[PDB]
Design a protein around this ligand. Sequence first.
Ligand SMILES: *[C@@H]1O[C@H](CO)[C@@H](O[C@@H]2O[C@H](CO)[C@@H](O[C@@H]3O[C@H](CO)[C@@H](O)[C@H](O[C@H]4O[C@H](CO)[C@@H](O)[C@H](O)[C@@H]4O)[C@@H]3O)[C@H](O)[C@H]2NC(C)=O)[C@H](O)[C@H]1NC(C)=O
Ligand SMILES: *[C@@H]1O[C@H](CO)[C@@H](O[C@@H]2O[C@H](CO)[C@@H](O)[C@H](O)[C@H]2NC(C)=O)[C@H](O)[C@H]1NC(C)=O
Ligand SMILES: CCc1nn2c(=O)cc(N3CCNCC3)nc2s1
Ligand SMILES: *[C@@H]1O[C@H](CO)[C@@H](O)[C@H](O)[C@H]1NC(C)=O
Ligand SMILES: [Ca+2]
Ligand SMILES: [Ca+2]
Ligand SMILES: [Ca+2]
Ligand SMILES: [Ca+2]
Ligand SMILES: [Ca+2]
Ligand SMILES: [Ca+2]
Ligand SMILES: [Mg+2]
Lengths: 454, 219, 214, 466
Amino acid sequence: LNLDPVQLTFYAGPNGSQFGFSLDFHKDSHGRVAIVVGAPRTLGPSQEETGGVFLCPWRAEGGQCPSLLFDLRDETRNVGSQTLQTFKARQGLGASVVSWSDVIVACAPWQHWNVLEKTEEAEKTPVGSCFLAQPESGRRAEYSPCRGNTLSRIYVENDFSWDKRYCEAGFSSVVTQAGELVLGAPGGYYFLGLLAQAPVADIFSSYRPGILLWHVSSQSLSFDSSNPEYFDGYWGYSVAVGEFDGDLNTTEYVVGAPTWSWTLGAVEILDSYYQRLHRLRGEQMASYFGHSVAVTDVNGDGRHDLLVGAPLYMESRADRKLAEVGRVYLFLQPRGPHALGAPSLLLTGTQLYGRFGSAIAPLGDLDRDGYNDIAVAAPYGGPSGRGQVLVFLGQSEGLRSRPSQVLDSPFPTGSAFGFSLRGAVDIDDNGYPDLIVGAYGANQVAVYRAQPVV
Amino acid sequence: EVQLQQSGAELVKPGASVKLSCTASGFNIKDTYVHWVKQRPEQGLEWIGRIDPANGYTKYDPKFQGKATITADTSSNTAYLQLSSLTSEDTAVYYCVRPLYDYYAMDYWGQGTSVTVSSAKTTAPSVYPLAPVCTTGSSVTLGCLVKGYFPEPVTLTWNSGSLSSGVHTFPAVLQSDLYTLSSSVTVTSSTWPSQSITCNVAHPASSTKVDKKIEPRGP
Amino acid sequence: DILMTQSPSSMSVSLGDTVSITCHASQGISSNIGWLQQKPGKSFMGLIYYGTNLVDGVPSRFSGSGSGADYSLTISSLDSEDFADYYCVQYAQLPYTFGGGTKLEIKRADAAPTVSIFPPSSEQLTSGGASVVCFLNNFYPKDINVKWKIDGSERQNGVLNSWTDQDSKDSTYSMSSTLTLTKDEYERHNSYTCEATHKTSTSPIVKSFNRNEC
Amino acid sequence: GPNICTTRGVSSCQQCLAVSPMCAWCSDEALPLGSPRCDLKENLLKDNCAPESIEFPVSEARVLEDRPLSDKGSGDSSQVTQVSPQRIALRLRPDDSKNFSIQVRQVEDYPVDIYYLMDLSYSMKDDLWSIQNLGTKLATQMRKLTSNLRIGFGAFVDKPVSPYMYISPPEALENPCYDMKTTCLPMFGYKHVLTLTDQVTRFNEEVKKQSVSRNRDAPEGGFDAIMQATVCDEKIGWRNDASHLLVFTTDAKTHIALDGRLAGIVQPNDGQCHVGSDNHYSASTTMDYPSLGLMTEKLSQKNINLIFAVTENVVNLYQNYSELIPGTTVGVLSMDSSNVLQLIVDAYGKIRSKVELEVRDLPEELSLSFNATCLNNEVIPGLKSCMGLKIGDTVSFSIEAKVRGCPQEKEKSFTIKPVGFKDSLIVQVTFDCDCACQAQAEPNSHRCNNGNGTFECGVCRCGPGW
Ligand SMILES: *[C@@H]1O[C@H](CO)[C@@H](O[C@@H]2O[C@H](CO)[C@@H](O[C@@H]3O[C@H](CO)[C@@H](O)[C@H](O[C@H]4O[C@H](CO)[C@@H](O)[C@H](O)[C@@H]4O)[C@@H]3O)[C@H](O)[C@H]2NC(C)=O)[C@H](O)[C@H]1NC(C)=O
Ligand SMILES: *[C@@H]1O[C@H](CO)[C@@H](O[C@@H]2O[C@H](CO)[C@@H](O)[C@H](O)[C@H]2NC(C)=O)[C@H](O)[C@H]1NC(C)=O
Ligand SMILES: CCc1nn2c(=O)cc(N3CCNCC3)nc2s1
Ligand SMILES: *[C@@H]1O[C@H](CO)[C@@H](O)[C@H](O)[C@H]1NC(C)=O
Ligand SMILES: [Ca+2]
Ligand SMILES: [Ca+2]
Ligand SMILES: [Ca+2]
Ligand SMILES: [Ca+2]
Ligand SMILES: [Ca+2]
Ligand SMILES: [Ca+2]
Ligand SMILES: [Mg+2]
């Protein structure tokens, strides 16, 4: 309703860097809000693309941002009669970023790895890696849970069980309130997908540079399966956290698996031991149900609700024709231990190929009426096809079915405006929570400031 | 708190086999590689091999191929070292080891399991007094020889541990399948023999506790 | 296999010193070295991994350095707990191999040994044996040499030596030497002598006795 | 007595016609003191209204082009007629309806293009062997149905990019099968091999030189290939006047839009041809797999009939995709493709067993209703499609157009076309809501309130603007 679409703030990265692919708000130890931005095609030292991360201080006028520097050099370690190898070319550093406390986590999901032993090897594969930074202190750490030192032959001989070589750890990421990093790794276990969790404190305290393979003992990874419903499911394509079992001393995980069960798609709600509490199935195959997931209480009863995006959902139209427009599904959490039911509300896109539901961002309470609100991206939506973000306000029965406000991309065609979104943080300290929108195709981020309702 | 808890001292014959255990406390044994290491006083430290208990795959120094077999049971959170066709050279202290952080490192150690390979039947010690001979000095020294016992240990004291200071009980040494040990005690010339001094040697293995009073040689 | 040559095999030092233990590998091991500590009669504790990284719990007076084939463990300001055995281990290649170790011992003033000699007991003789014992007590430094003589001529067979660890509250060392013979062989000779050679004297400390006579 | 025409009390000839299609208007100068000008034509003539003064348009449907249906579709040059009539002229007065007819024929001996698009991952090695005489055998069986068969071939594996592609050791790039005891081709996304031709031994000989490659993950890159084989018209060589059959053979799941992000590919498929002179798809490593809706759009625009010829283990899957891509047909492929000939011949029959009318550019104001007379020779009402047809069969549809009110534009036109057919019925609509005497109206008439008004069709009208 009350985001200001007249006076925006723009931040810009280098041409071709894909600045804005991922973003998040970052509070320093003093509570000053900045914006961390991922730019996964930023050029590294060898003029190869490796990705980069930027830490943008808040300024109404916007502009350019300083880099948050991470080590971009390939590494080699000869140890235990093996040669360990990291490969950072085209790794996509900044394909995800998330901030928690005064720490920033930025991931390179396509970072490759190999282990050589005489004439054999593990195979050069995208295990992914995450980089952690405490900007104020300069501390750095890394987390790469899928790295191994098993040779190719052993997986073949063991029928490719526990195969974490193609994890792409960090493809999605989220941090629990208590400071546990949870990474989505959609290539895990031969493309089933997995989640890897470890406390941030333990990641820092257990990392040392140059070791490359090291134990984070407090970590927990999800499990492999022989159920072909899970095969090529990309479980971990998206991830979120919330409270869904009623016990406030446990955090639950929400995991998107957009190609689950032969491309039907699913989202699952799990406890922290990776035991499934609920499963929501997609409605239409190939719709990519689970592409995006969001958790927020939209109806003011104190119980978290779930929003799921299916950006390629084809709506039924006249004369038995289908139109790809995208769809968002709201599931309100009921009282007690019961199942999440049928969706409470279906929101559906209007512009063909708009990909409505590609990103869904909790906004907090934008209009300050007591109910939390959301923003849904259609990165190729709008009448012009340039991209749109739609705001939906919460209310006692869920969300309103018609948007309160629509933000048309200020960038040219192809910008992917809305592909990344973050809200619920007041960046200018005016008492209303604001929205940041990435447009990686234009290498820019737009900040929308919330203002008093008119 | 990480702690590797090993089995007690083993005491076996030549040609026999033995299986030492190493049990993980405060962590899951599948978490890291587990290594076994042999220590002797003379030859020093030797890496036997390692296992990944998660999958059971092992590596060995080719010197120990045939002799040592490392296994693991994730169920009982325990790793094992079996040694076969035992000989004198296998008498040593055996340790299980795991890394802290580095996959390949050697940071946490169990307390060690001592193995002794001998044909010696349990034999009680002969305990002999050692009074001086030839003389009129101010400081004096006596002794106690414990000869031909098996197995270790022997607790040696004087006057039931009353006289404790000025004492030197030397490490036992092996002499053709049996142990010998000695102790010296030093006192002022007026004390002995006017105040009685006695050597108390306990050998729990043979359930013996001989009491030898140190007497002079024809006073 | 990679040979780890650790130096020095021992050093006599004092509280508060900075000392260094070096380790040389037969080839480059790119910092894949650990340092270990074994206190007297105790198990092992890890000090350093990957060349320079303190194991959790280890004080910062310990530090590791080096590169290629040459590495050092330095201990600034020696504590009383630091008198112990130290070893290097390489894990660049299987099999893992260890240094021969270094013992840190307590520095102190030179002290000559108290030498005492003891003939066989009556008890032992009646059972058929004859053991001549010689104690060399409370000396420093640790390097000592004992020689047995029978009627003035050296005897080497049938001798059994034992050495104590450095004593906790005077830092001296002590030794026991035992010459065992058969009764009948002991009765073939008259003179029995224990000769202790030590850096405190140019000539040896000699203790003898004649069988029967006193 | 007073009917609806008269009781409405209309002010003009235009308003008179808008009351009902049975109303007429009399322009006669000499009409009695106060008789009603809007009435039934029967009532106007009896009241001495002149024959030339009657305005009474009748709705009608006259044919402009109705060439007869062709008996043969080959039929060279291809002036074949499958829809009769081809053009008619509708005239409609306000709120009126008129009916007309259309015949549609599934013509015998029509040209066919069959482009064979084959999964050439390693599990299809044995299939490559089975089909090496397919071109010859297919020609023999299709000869019964058509005298103008062209066939061609293309092949796909997946995006040649990690993690789909093995990228170590260097030997694996040149020969993905190096750690097995064979050699296969370097991985490829989609390659066109043989442009559609009547020279069927070209197919046999091309297929005999093809070999498989090898990649890591089960879903394959066939949807990329369907897109390119569809939008690269000139390279694939689809003919304007032929049935287009695109035979997709695979034994595995498929990659879909948004899967590409696992290879770092986020750029959406642009639905354009990217197969150049080297005959490989050059955007394979830089553009995402296509969505079902984009495939549907392109398949429909190029009139391509997609056939999923897939193994039993993925039949349910592709049948379910088929439901989301209307007009797609599914057949069960054996594990070595030994039954693919009959699968293609049955698919062709199923493809040409339906006539489904589609309406394009229908004006807002117009409504249509359809009654169908299919193979049985009897009427099924409210229906605009026939099924279970044989090649050679003719069906017909009765159509009624109803106009609501009268629109601003008096001339519009729309099209009725069977799905997938070349030929169509163009309907030219004229809206007859005006009176001829309006063209001979008289503004500023001395006869109308002393010059203030306009004299049209016998009455005075208040001028512009009063
Ligand atoms: C291709 O599409 C077909 C048709 O949609 C699809 O088959 C369907 O599969 C679904 C899911 O496997 C089946 O759904 C079941 O319906 C029966 C009613 O007869 C119920 O008993 C089932 O309920 C149980 O299981 C549910 C979870 O799936 C639970 O929610 C529930 O509590 C029960 O435990 C269930 O709803 C359905 O039977 C078929 N439909 C048909 C017509 O066959 C098929 O899977 C698709 N295949 C591929 C490869 O895409
Ligand atoms: C389609 O057929 C139906 C009959 O099933 C026709 O509908 C009826 O037509 C008769 C003609 O005398 C009328 O009596 C009925 O009132 C009609 N019912 C309706 C219109 O609902 C219809 O005429 C046929 N339509 C076409 C386009 O030919
Ligand atoms: C070499 C060709 C293989 N394909 N392939 C798959 O598609 C899935 C899978 N899984 C599924 C999850 N549990 C592990 C094995 N393993 C393999 S091995
Ligand atoms: C309209 O339908 C009638 C029968 O209801 C038929 O006789 C007439 O020919 C049809 N008109 C046209 C143009 O086909
Ligand atoms: Ca909970
Ligand atoms: Ca709620
Ligand atoms: Ca609100
Ligand atoms: Ca604000
Ligand atoms: Ca096959
Ligand atoms: Ca594939
Ligand atoms: Mg395949």
